[PDB]
Point group: none
Chain length 124, copies 2
């Protein structure tokens, strides 16, 4: 059964490219990472930094999570990210996305021993 840590890696990590990649990126990546399986996931962010650098955020700036939980952490440095946002034309099972590149601080929720990212909360 997929661990929460592994699910975060599948849904949110893409170290293999420095940036957006292409206008196609979100269409390809939302499908290949199985985020269009049961429904079109309406929004999803991929982080283009090393796994060790994203795991290290769990030791950085503690901030409130959107859901009111206390276990969220904001990166001190900006990170290369890609935001995927479902289009209006997008109809399951043909999920369509706008690909946007940004350099922003990430906010992730961390849990466990070891203490690792398990949810992507926000970028700022």
């Amino acid at each position: 059964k997929e661990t929460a840590a592994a699910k975060f890696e599948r849904q949110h990590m893409d170290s293999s490219t420095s940036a957006a990649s292409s206008s196609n990126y979100c269409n390809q990546m939302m499908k290949s990472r199985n985020l269009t399986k049961d429904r079109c996931k309406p929004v999803n962010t991929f982080v283009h930094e090393s796994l060790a650098d994203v795991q290290a955020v769990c030791s950085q700036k503690n901030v409130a999570c959107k859901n009111g939980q206390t276990n969220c952490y904001q990166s001190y440095s900006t990170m290369s990210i890609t935001d995927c946002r479902e289009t209006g034309s997008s109809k399951y099972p043909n999920c369509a996305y706008k690909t946007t590149q940004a350099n922003k601080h990430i906010i992730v929720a961390c849990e466990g021993n070891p203490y690792v990212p398990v949810h992507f909360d926000a970028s700022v």
Copy 2:
């Protein structure tokens, strides 16, 4: 505007592990915590204990601070730390550091409500 307590956590707290895995820890950490932006910060210590354990130092042994203030506190126990010191040949912007692990008492200045560390004074 960053609070002194927040600046202490950014510059000095790395609760992640109980040491530092590689000789490259300080090069990476001095980067990730924004301590190489304008210039290489020459010397900096990271503490690998829980935030709660470090905050509890503010209730431990009262000692004078280097600057002659009276609000410094020495940890009763030794703590896992990493000393980062810039090499003799280090030239901004390629800030280069020797990483050294140690188990030492820490001395911190405490202030505010809550009464928490706001400055790292020394390890002994």
